[model samples]
Target: MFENITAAPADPILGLADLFRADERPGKINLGIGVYKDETGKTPVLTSVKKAEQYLLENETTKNYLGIDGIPEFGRCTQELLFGKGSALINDKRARTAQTPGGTGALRVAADFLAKNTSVKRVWVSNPSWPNHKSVFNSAGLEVREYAYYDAENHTLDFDALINSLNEAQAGDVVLFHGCCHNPTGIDPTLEQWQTLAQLSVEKGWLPLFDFAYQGFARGLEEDAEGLRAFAAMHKELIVASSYSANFGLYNERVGACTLVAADSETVDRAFSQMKAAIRANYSNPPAHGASVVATILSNDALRAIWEQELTDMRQRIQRMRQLFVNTLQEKGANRDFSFIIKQNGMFSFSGLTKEQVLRLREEFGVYAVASGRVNVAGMTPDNMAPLCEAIVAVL
Candidate 1:
């Protein structure tokens, strides 16, 4: 039965991480995998997370299984985060939420629910979205399509092309938008563009599904949620896949939530019923520790304040690195224009380097990034910026 199985290669992101791990170069910089690191080149756990764990350790008493939807407090917290505290959707009970394994898990659950329940057969994603976007939808038996997002040549969001491409999406199809801090390219729609995107989706009749993985990484949490909030205000129904891994530094805890809003409370209840069925058939329930920690911190105002500060610090550091990378490259007389890097949001950016240049960067200077030129800005530090820029200029 196992005969003649073809070998498989690791995914592009992880594959580069493997190579970086074995490079044996003392100053080799890793800009491939997505994770938040500080100036010391270490991914530090937030002090808020530590305090929450301490509380959980002293207070928690059971290893019991949660309901298919997980803790009620977590579900409520997720809703409040996506929609503001006084949001009309929450006041009317028009939104429902379920905790999942991670943002990816939330997406998979959404895909599965769509595949198993809805008549919609297709899903659309950005042209250069996180590679897993297509994989998750395809695995759930949905046709995948791409819409124009980034103008690689100019290194900016291609808003006009995006509008043109999305014109093809028909009513009832699920179109995924990076809620904020778009991955890989790091270019997100402007505030007005986000409102326009929302209007277009409602007018075109396609459902908008937001992949909100980096809420705090872009700006303040509330500010980052502006795009999805725009969708909520216009569309009676929408979906959000929220990830706490980046914001709370709970990467291994796999904390995420899938939220669906309907026109009314009864309708939301019915849709969430179907959503619970999808989750039950899949993972059954979410893990307790991460979501509990989130709930504990969020419910306690003091802890919440600490978490906000930590998040603010991380967001500012990533922005600083972006500026520093551009300044260093400019000082080094880089052959290509790189000022756009400073304007992009989030942790990742497409440097516009070709595959050959990316390869040369690795072989010559031990600097690693994706073959498509997507580099993790969070990986850059004050110490690595000079050499990283030098290698990039040499390759250019």
Candidate 2:
């Protein structure tokens, strides 16, 4: 019976990690993965999270299981983080939140919940979305469609194409929007563009589903949430999948939440019950450690401030690296125009390198990047810049 099990293909991002680790090259560089690393090439835990963990370790008395929806404090704090403190949706009791294992878990939960609770059979994702987007929604039995997003030829957003595709979206369809710091590409919509999309969403009666995996990593937290807030203000219902891994450095803990904004408490009541049933059938409940850490930091004023500052530092460093990457390429007099690197936000830069160039960089120079030319900007350091630049220029 077991002989029928075939080998599964390796995940592109995670597979690159295994190859990088086994290379044994003294100067090997890994730009394939999307984790946030500091100038010293370390993924350090934020001081705020560290302190919160210490406090929990001291004050926590029990390890009892959380409710099927997870901790109430975690959900409440997460709602405030996603929407502003005085958001009309929250004050009106129109929002529902449930903790999940991580961002991917949140997406899966949303997919499952939507499949059960609504008539939505299809989800519109960006053309070059996160690799797992199609897999997750498809696994949940939803048809996944792509909308025009990045213009690789010109290295910019195809706004007209996006608007046109959205214009054709049927009412009750779900469209996934990256709240900020779009993974793999890092390009995001301008505020004006986002506003136009929000208005279009209202006019079209399509539900906006926001995947907010890297909030503070893009711009400031509030600025990054602008798109979500805009949608909530215009639409009576929306979906949000949020994660704390990137901002709080809690990747292993897998802390995240799936949120729904409905028209009223009655709708939230019924919708949340369905969500709870979905979670019950799935994992039963989320893990406690990560959500507790996030809630503790967000609840305390001083800790929250520290966390904000740390997140700001991370964002600034990624931006600085982006500038450094473009400047270095320009100084080398490379044939390509790399000005778009500085314009892209978050931890990634769609480096515009071909798949063949990516392979050559890995095989010849031990510089690993995604086949789609996405480089984790956070993976760079001053120490690695010279050789990385040399490797890239060679391939170009």
Cα lDDT of all candidates, in order? 0.91, 0.90
Q: Model 1, 267-370: lDDT tens per residue?
A: 99998999999999898999999999999999999999999999999999999999999999989888767888898888898898998999999988999898
- Lowest-scoring 10 consecutive residues by lDDT in candidate 2? 327-336
Model 1 clash tally, residue pairs: 0
- Candidate 1 local Cα displacement, residue 365, angstroms: 2.0
* Stretch of 10 with least lDDT, candidate 1: 9-18
Q: Report the CA-based lDDT of candidate 1 relative to the real structure.
A: 0.91
Candidate 2's residue-wise lDDT over 213-254, tens digit each?
998887788999998888888889998999998999899999
- In model 2, pairs of residues that clash are none
| Residue 173 C-alpha lDDT in model 1 | 93
